[model samples]
Target: PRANTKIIVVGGGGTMGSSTALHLLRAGYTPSNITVLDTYPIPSAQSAGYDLNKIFGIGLRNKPDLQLYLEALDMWKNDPLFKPFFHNVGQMDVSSTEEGIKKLRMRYQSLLDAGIGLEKTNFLLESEDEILAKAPHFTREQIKGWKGLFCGDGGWLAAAKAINAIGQFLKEQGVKFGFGEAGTFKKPLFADADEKTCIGVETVDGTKYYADKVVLAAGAWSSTLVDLEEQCVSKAWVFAHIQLTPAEAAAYKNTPVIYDGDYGFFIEPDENGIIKVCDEFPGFTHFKMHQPYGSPVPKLISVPRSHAKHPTDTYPHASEVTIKKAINRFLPRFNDKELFNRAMCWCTDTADANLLVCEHPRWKGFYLATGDSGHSFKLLPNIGKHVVELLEGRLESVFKDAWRWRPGSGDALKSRRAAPAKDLADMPGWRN
Candidate 1:
């Protein structure tokens, strides 16, 4: 790629998109030659990363998981740009169910078997005392038979602020930006009438952008913009916030993020004393008849309804029950706290829970960089570097194979989750 090579990044305000744009500049592409298009300004309110905080931990699921996380960890801790957003107090995963405890043990064994220095940083808390040793906020009664896995290196990322920082960096570097309808992707522009070669893209506002390469990192909305041939399904996860008193916030200050697969997770409070709580579920989908670009006709697609656009919308009433349940388990003392900012966070999931980051086989210069599977926010710091590699055609096979374009792979509606997502149409009490 030459310094003058022009590239357009769709959804460039989001995590993957912003990272891709940032890495493109870092890879020596002229800042002015890069164009970032999104539905909103940098740190897009609709973007999944536009949140108070997100979990960051070591992933041992796939072949390249360890390498990817280690790099993200290093960057989050040392990179001047990302360091401030990383609250590395720690992270803990605990469970009370027998099956859940077994999985935790298996996970611990897997970490040990890797023969990496993870053993030094990760520990298994078999007793309540051991759990309290790391998280003293929880009382013995609250965690009687629970087994825990503590990651000293894991913590929460200051999600929205991190993306905002990236946005500021891109602005300082003179990267071109387009928002509103001008940033909304309408369709790709072909080099000729044959429409065989993708040359650029046209936005919803009829603005035509010409670039040597076009990266579609639209997050949950990627499938809606272009047909992914059912390779990805978009789902919505829910979260709500509770404002704590100053003293109460201080008591929980520096607490490690706590996660439970059977329930949900809660991160420590922010500077303003806001604690975000989320429930653990497959997710919710809003299926409707819609035609993405490649689709010959409109099909049933799970389209996202963003809170940014609909301020009155909240999560499903079922989510309220589950979220309250999570709070009862994780922050029992705060059960009386009022829940605000109750909204949905959308993510596109590939069948196997890996990302969908590869060039479209039919469109040469077009790329797909989505399918986060609800866990790629932590990759905000380094995922884009690899995306640039993919664009330059030098991506390692490990990632290439893992994120290859595979249709009819599996059921994305239930991608690595306990069950298929319940459609929003079927759930009640979310809309005004």
Candidate 2:
């Protein structure tokens, strides 16, 4: 089930790119044959996977999303070489208001309507009592009228840990890695020939490395390497790993991932006893690295990998205050306790957030998996296989067409979220 081949993945030093290389190795490719180049080593501030947190695969219902969700879960369970840092501590989604409850209802019905595997979609317990039983940290006021949903099987993916383990294992198993002070992604390299073939990538220092296939997965910067025009934009989201002493954590008795669907605020439980919290609010649409406010098309992108070396992120300003404020209302458990650590996740916001996994039309041999839009990390274990499938030309029509290249029509981009809500919980700007 693996590809015994050579592939060069840009941005492979961390997150999606590293996982893609790891998965590519898992798919039968020779370890040394795969090259993952990153400008900075681990702990890089600019790396998307550097400060990532828990995984949330519970609310999924889309046909392709669920298929990858279940496959990814199975990979975590059965893949011996790649199965650490995941805790099977169930996940929950509860509402603090009737409007939130309405959203939860819509979330549930959408899943059922999609015919998600009977065992999977039915995992949500509609009762508030049931949800609170699993997550007792909720106060009386919140749960009394709380209309929430619960999924007993969803768990957390200790991102840095699991990813570190895999990356190290691959290094030992023979995957070639290039991590240095400079960044590896400059612009996607193309071969000069009759047919437009993407040969490989060149670094900022002018080192050009070629490969059989190249995958672009640099979080928010991913948009710069493509030609989707306005179909792709990068959104800056604030993520915080708030420090909590066991004393601070005990207030909630280890609350698992609690996703408040209505309010868009959720708390994630880190194994280190820190609570990772984030709230849903409007985020800033950012331009690609090296890109200016009104630049033209085909602008390449790049960023430094480390904070000490060349830090690009600032202390999360509006993200921390705004998200924490959203939860502060019903979040009486332990208010804005401490600011452990903050990270601004660059979501490769695309047309409707639908991921683009198709081969490059202009560049014959290039393939892309960008437009993560905050969704790629959860399915990291199996997404590289999806890449293999597409390249091998055996991918199913459902996923193939969904992720294929399409131009802007204002509404030209299709979303990876729930299907057009006209049939279910249809609301504008509701990306859930």
Candidate 3:
């Protein structure tokens, strides 16, 4: 890639988009030649990257998953730009059900089989005392039959602040930016009527941005802007917050993040005495008729309605029940606390739950960098480095093959989740 090669990153305020822009500058691309566009300023309000915290842990999903996690861990721990936001309080995965315990055992086995000395930092806890040794918040009765997997290095990340740090760096580097209507992506611009070559993108306000390459890292909204050939389905996961007294918060300080696949997860309280709680579920979808740029007709798509745009909106009523159940299981002492800031975060999932990060097959110079599958937030620190590699044709085959453009691979709606997502239209008490 030439130093003067211009690049446009759509949704550049979010995770992958922001990271790509950051890496573009680090890779010697001219600062003025790089454009960051989004509906909101850096760390876009609507992007899922605009959050309080996200789980960071070692992944045993696949070779690429493990490699990316290792790389991200290094950056979050050692990179000055990201080091401040990493809270390495450790992480715990516990389960009391028989089936859940069996799966935890397999995951533990996989970690040991990797032969990377994970055994030194990861352990399997089979007793309530053992689980309490890592997660003191839980009591003997709360985790009587529980088995836990303790990842000594895993913890929660300061999601929004870390992205904001990236934004600060990008601004200091003099990267161009567009927001609001002028920053909202409308469609890709083609060089000719043949429509085989993508020259750039046109935003919602009719602002035309031409570039040598255009990357659509629109997160959950990617398929809505352009045709993805049914390779991705957008879904929403819910979270709510409860406040604690200052002294109460102090007791939970430095507490390890605890997660149970059957219930949910909760992290330690922030300085503001707010603790975020989320339930484990398949996710929810809002399907409606919509036509993307490449589609000849409007089709069914699960459109995302962000809480940032609709400040009055809350998660569906069904979420309330599960969230409370999670609190009763994980933080029973605070079961009666009022929940606030209840909202949804959206993510797109591909058939195999890998990612859809390849270039559009027919539209040259156009690339797609979404399909997070709800687990890619942990990839924030280093995922962009690989996206830059893909742009320069240097991405390893393992990553390329995992993130390839295969539309008919499987069912994206039920992509590795317990079941297909329940549509929001059928649920009630959340529209306002």
lDDT of every model, 2 decimals: 0.93, 0.61, 0.91
Per-residue lDDT over 1-432 for candidate 2, one digit per residue giving the tens place of the 0 to 100 score: 234456777777656777777767666788877877766554334665655466546545334676777788888777875466566666667675767777777777776776745446345556667766777776656666666666556667777766677677777887776666234566666667544877777776777777788877665666654555555555555565556577666756545567664345455545567666666644444333455212453353322222334244443454556666755743555564665555555565555556777887777777777767666777767777777777678788878886778666333122343321121012122121
- Model 2 ranges off by over 4 Å: 1-5, 42-45, 59-61, 116-128, 181-183, 193-195, 251-254, 266-268, 288-317, 409-432
Candidate 2 least-lDDT 10 residues = 421-430
Question: Which ranking of candidates, highest lDDT first?
Answer: 1, 3, 2
Model 3 score (lDDT): 0.91
Q: For model 1, how does the per-residue alpha-carbon lDDT over 1-432 read when each residue is reduced to its tens digit?
A: 559799999999999999999899888999999999998999998999999999999888878889999999999999999999999988899999989999999999999988977889999999999999889999889999999999999899999999999999999999999999999999999988766789999998999999999999999999999999888899999999999989998878899999999889999989999999999999999898888997879888999998999999998999999999999999999999999989999999889999999999888899999999898999999999999999999999999999999999999999988899899999999995
lDDT of 3 at 364: 91
In candidate 2, residue 15 scores what lDDT? 68
Give all TM-scores, in the order shown.
0.99, 0.83, 0.98
What are the root-mean-square deviations of the candidates from the true structure over C-alphas?
0.9, 6.0, 1.0
Clashing pairs in 2: 2-27, 3-27, 39-182, 39-183, 39-184, 243-340
Question: Is candidate 2 or 3 superior in TM-score?
Answer: 3
Give the winner by lDDT: 2 or 3.
3
